[PDB]
Design a protein around this ligand. Structure first.
Ligand code: HEM
Ligand SMILES: c1ccc(-c2cnc[nH]2)cc1
Length: 375
C-alpha cells in the first residue's frame, strides 16, 4: 500500500509539497517565481537561454525532485508559448532541456508539465493549523497575472482531495468480497458514493475562482502540449537530449488517478476497446507518477466488484453500487456544463469544440452504461 504513495488525507496529491530548492538551484527558482513579470516584459526567453546547465544530483529526495519538475515544467511552458499569442519556440535550450529530461527520466514522467506537477505538487497551506480549504491555500507557481491558475489548480486539487476520502475504503471493499462480508461491502460502497457525492459540491467553486475569458484565452494556452498540435506539429526539440523533436500531450485531468481509479474499481471499462477516448485515457497513465500507475494496474488485477454485486440477487448491494456509478455520472455531467461555460462560449466570442464535447460525452455515456438498474 505504501508503495502506492497514497496519502490518508490528500490521496494522490503530494502531502505538504516542498517550496524551496537547495541554493544550488536558485537560478531556476528565480525564473519560475517571477514568470508573470518575466514573460510579460519579454525577459523570460533570454534568461532561459542564458542559464548554465545545473546538475540534477543535488536534488536528493522525492519532494525536492517533484518541486524541481514543477519549476522546470512551468519554465518550459513559458519558454515554448512565450506571451501566449502564438509565437512559439520549437527548441528547448540544452541547458534546461538536459537536466529536465534527466530528472523526468529518474521520476519516470515525461519532460512536459503534467497534472501531478501543476496540481498535485503545486500547493501549500497559508496557515499550517487551519484545514485544507481554499481560503487557507495557495499555489506555488502561476504563469501570468490574472491567469486564474490559483482557482484552477486549487479547485482541481480540492476535488482530488475530496475523492481521497473514498480511496482508503478500497481495501475494505476487496476484503469484504473475499471474506463474504455482505454488510461490510454494502457499507463500504455507500461510503464511496458519499465521498464522490461530496466531491461534486467542491467542484462548484470553479465558478467563484476562475473566469471564462482568462481561462480560455490565457491558462489553456500555457497548459497546452505538443502532441497532435499544429503549432508544433513534430513536437519539441529537447536540445542535447534527443536528436529528433518529441511529442507529449499537455497537462490534463485525464492524468488524475482519482477518476481513473474509480472507473477501474467499479468495472466501468473506460479504457476498453480501440476508440479515441479509451486510448487517450490509457495513454494518460504514462503521465502519472509510476507509483500511481502501479496502483491502477493492481486495481485492474483484483476480482471484479461489479461481477460480485451482479451475482448476489441483493437489491441493497445493487443500489449501493449504482449510487457509486451515479456519483461519477453527476460529476461528469456537471463537468460538461463547466466545459460549455469555460470553453465553448468563450471560443464562440473570439474574433474543435465538438470533438472535445464528444470525448467527454463518450466517457460520461460509458459511465452511465454501467448502471445495473436504469439510475
Ligand atoms: C474551467 C474548468 C475546467 C475545464 C474547462 C475543463 C476542461 C476539460 C477538457 C477540455 C477535458 C478533456 C481532456 C483534455 O483536453 O485534456 C477535460 C477532461 C477531464 N476533466 Fe476537466 N475541465 C475543468 C475542470 C476540471 C476539474 C476541476 C476537474 C477535477 C479534477 C476536472 C476533471 C476532468 C477529468 C477527470 C477529465 C477526464 C475525462 C473524465 O474522466 O470524465 N476538470 N476537462
Ligand atoms: C491542471 C488542472 C486541471 C486540468 C484539467 C481539468 N480538466 C482537464 N484537465 C489540467 C491541468
Amino acid at each position: 500500500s505504501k508503495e502506492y504513495h497514497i496519502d490518508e488525507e490528500v490521496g494522490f496529491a503530494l502531502p505538504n509539497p516542498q517550496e524551496n530548492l537547495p541554493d544550488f538551484y536558485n537560478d531556476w527558482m528565480f525564473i519560475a517565481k517571477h514568470l508573470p513579470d518575466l514573460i510579460e516584459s519579454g525577459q523570460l526567453r533570454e534568461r532561459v537561454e542564458k542559464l548554465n546547465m545545473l546538475s540534477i544530483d543535488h536534488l536528493t529526495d522525492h519532494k525536492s525532485q517533484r518541486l524541481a519538475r514543477l519549476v522546470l515544467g512551468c519554465i518550459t511552458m513559458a519558454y515554448v508559448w512565450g506571451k501566449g499569442h502564438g509565437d512559439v519556440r520549437k527548441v528547448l535550450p540544452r541547458n534546461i532541456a538536459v537536466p529536465y529530461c534527466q530528472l523526468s527520466k529518474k521520476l519516470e514522467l515525461p519532460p512536459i508539465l503534467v497534472y501531478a506537477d501543476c496540481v498535485l505538487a503545486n500547493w501549500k497551506k497559508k496557515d499550517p493549523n487551519k484545514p485544507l480549504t481554499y481560503e487557507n491555500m495557495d499555489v506555488l507557481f502561476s504563469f501570468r497575472d490574472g491567469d486564474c491558475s490559483k482557482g484552477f489548480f486549487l479547485v482541481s486539487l480540492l476535488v482530488e482531495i475530496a475523492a481521497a476520502s473514498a480511496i482508503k475504503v478500497i481495501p475494505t471493499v476487496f476484503k469484504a468480497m473475499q471474506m463474504q462480508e455482505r454488510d461490510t461491502l454494502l457499507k463500504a460502497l455507500l461510503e464511496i458514493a458519499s465521498c464522490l457525492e461530496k466531491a461534486l459540491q467542491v467542484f462548484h467553486q470553479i465558478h467563484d475562482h476562475v473566469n471564462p475569458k482568462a481561462f480560455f484565452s490565457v491558462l489553456r494556452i500555457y497548459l497546452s502540449g505538443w502532441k497532435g498540435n499544429p503549432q508544433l506539429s513534430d513536437g519539441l526539440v529537447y536540445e542535447g537530449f534527443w536528436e529528433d523533436p518529441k511529442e507529449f500531450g499537455g497537462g490534463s485531468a485525464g492524468q488524475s488517478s482519482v477518476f481513473q481509479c474509480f472507473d477501474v474499481l467499479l468495472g466501468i471499462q473506460q479504457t476498453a476497446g480501440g476508440g479515441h477516448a479509451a486510448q487517450f485515457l490509457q495513454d494518460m497513465r504514462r503521465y502519472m507518477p509510476p507509483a500511481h500507475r502501479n496502483f491502477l494496474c493492481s486495481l485492474e488485477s483484483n476480482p471484479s466488484v461489479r461481477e460480485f454485486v451482479l451475482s448476489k440477487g441483493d437489491a441493497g448491494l445493487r443500489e449501493a453500487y449504482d449510487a457509486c456509478v451515479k456519483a461519477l455520472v453527476s460529476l461528469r455531467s456537471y463537468h460538461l456544463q463547466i466545459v460549455t461555460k469555460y470553453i465553448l462560449i468563450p471560443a464562440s466570442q473570439q474574433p474543435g469544440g465538438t470533438d472535445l464535447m464528444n470525448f467527454l460525452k463518450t466517457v460520461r455515456s460509458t459511465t452511465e452504461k454501467s448502471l445495473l438498474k436504469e439510475g
